[PDB]
């Protein structure tokens, strides 16, 4: 047995929720007790620049955004089982870190 | 009338509020009546309130202001001239103290004096301008009951504000003198000079 | 409670060659003396055991001499050095607190001492301009 934490971060929620559900799915048919996923409060990375490359015109501003969504999943399983779950649910957008 | 024993003890005076809702738990709306048929529907005293602070939505529709309590409309007009905008608790304190001063003076019901000062302060005919693109022209027109009521509150608080400026007399007791004098129709009070001066000019335009 | 007195009030006081209104409260009456601010006057009154609830004329001569003694000798009455007007004096290096007539004299002496060496700060004092680096393009219109 091993208390293992899996942290999921990505910018887009569709691939994030697929990986999140897929990990939960593999922790269900395998009789592994789980806690999660925990939807962490999303982070809005905001950058407000001036539209004008020069300094002439009405003072108009862009407001760019970069939402970061974070999910943490707690697993009680041996380390070999949890790591192979990660390769099952590998997605280009979502990065995975595994901590005991 | 029975005194209700709670685990959290409740003061005697506030338990008396179960019988009746009174302004600041001191002033009753039951014996208050508007001595003018034309402003009954625009001076709202039928729904009693404890404190003149309701934080309601009276600016959404057109005539919702007529549904705001008359004392709350009065305390709203006190907080003016920049440094007082948004200071409603200060305004409520002034009104609460003003009513007590209006009570020790003339001994009447303080909110009755407030109602009397409002009916006597709204000009019944104001001379609107009909200037044709710059030239000076004035025409005498009638004044709606809503504008008649809310110009009384505007004039009553403006007069109280200026009487307390650079004066040792406090604003609460400048308002009490302003409200008491206008209630009895005395021309000494501000907002009665203004009301007379408005209706005097309107007489010279019809 | 309200108390009464006769003949003891003094309408006009004269302290350090300055006329003091006797009906002003003592802490703020002493502020008329140049070189004595509210913060300094508040402390000399507490060092002289003069309770602040008294008007200037209420004070007796015994208290008045006790105050002018303290203002002229602050360090001798456990008044901290950092609280003083003129600390680390230029010539003798001791902590001082200049008062009504001494203030403009030693303020002057600082100006020529700056002007004698012809420092930039001393020069700008001579011209009547602002010396602390303020912009004079648009506000120096007096």
């Amino acid at each position: 047995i091993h208390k293992i934490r899996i942290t999921l971060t990505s910018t887009k929620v569709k691939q994030l929720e697929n990986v999140s559900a897929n990990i939960i799915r593999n922790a269900a048919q395998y009789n592994i007790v789980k806690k999660g996923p925990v939807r962490m409060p999303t982070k809005v990375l905001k950058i407000t620049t001036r539209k004008t490359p020069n300094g002439e015109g009405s003072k108009t501003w862009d407001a760019y955004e970069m939402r970061i969504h974070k999910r943490v999943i707690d697993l009680q399983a041996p380390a070999s089982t949890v790591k192979r779950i990660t390769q099952i649910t590998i997605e280009p957008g979502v990065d995975v870190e595994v901590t005991i | 009338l029975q005194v209700v024993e709670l685990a959290t003890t409740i003061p005697l005076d506030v338990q008396e509020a179960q019988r009746e809702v009174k302004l600041f738990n001191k002033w009753s709306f039951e014996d208050v009546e508007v001595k003018d048929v034309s402003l009954v529907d625009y001076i709202q005293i039928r729904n009693p309130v404890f404190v003149s602070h309701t934080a309601g939505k009276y600016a959404s529709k057109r005539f919702r202001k007529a549904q705001c309590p008359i004392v709350e409309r009065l305390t709203n007009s006190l907080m003016m001239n920049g440094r007082n905008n948004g200071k409603k608790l200060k305004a409520v304190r002034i009104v609460k103290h003003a009513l007590e001063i209006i009570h020790v003076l003339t001994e009447q019901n303080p909110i009755q004096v407030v109602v009397d000062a409002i009916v006597n302060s709204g000009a019944r005919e104001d001379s609107t301008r009909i200037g044709s693109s710059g030239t000076v022209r004035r025409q005498a027109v009638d004044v709606s009951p809503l504008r008649r009521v809310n110009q009384a509150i505007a004039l009553l608080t403006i007069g109280a504000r200026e009487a307390s400026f650079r004066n040792i007399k406090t604003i609460a007791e400048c308002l009490a003198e302003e409200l008491i004098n206008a209630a009895k129709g005395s021309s000494t009070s501000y907002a009665i000079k203004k009301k007379d001066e408005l209706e005097r000019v309107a007489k010279s335009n019809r | 409670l309200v108390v009464q007195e006769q003949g003891s009030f003094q309408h006009i006081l004269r302290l350090l060659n300055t006329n003091i209104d006797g009906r002003i409260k003592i802490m703020y009456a002493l502020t008329k003396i140049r070189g004595v601010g509210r913060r300094y006057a508040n402390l000399v009154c507490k060092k002289a055991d003069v309770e602040l609830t008294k008007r200037a004329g209420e004070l007796t001569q015994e208290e008045l001499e006790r105050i002018v003694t303290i203002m002229q000798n602050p360090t001798n009455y456990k008044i901290p050095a950092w609280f003083l007007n003129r600390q680390k004096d230029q010539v003798d290096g001791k902590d001082y607190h200049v008062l009504a007539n001494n203030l403009e004299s030693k303020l002057r002496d600082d100006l020529e001492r700056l002007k004698k060496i012809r420092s930039h700060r001393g020069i700008r004092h001579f011209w009547g301009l602002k010396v602390r680096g303020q912009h004079t393009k648009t506000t120096s219109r007096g």
């Binding site: - | - | 002007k115 012809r118 930039h120 001393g122 020069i123 001579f126 011209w127 009547g128 301009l129």
Partner: protein
């Protein structure tokens, strides 16, 4: 008074005795081209 520091303490600021100028604004056909090189229809025809 060769050094500027020495002379500064001797030059007086005689500024309040002279009056400011009454006006001080000192900062036009944009539609008419001033290049003087007109474009012929052949050049527009060949390019576009």
């Amino acid at each position: 008074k060769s050094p500027t520091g020495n002379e500064a303490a001797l030059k007086n600021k005689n500024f309040n005795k002279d009056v400011a100028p009454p006006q001080s604004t000192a900062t036009p056909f944009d539609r008419h081209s001033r290049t003087g090189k007109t474009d012929s229809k052949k050049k527009l025809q060949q390019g576009w």
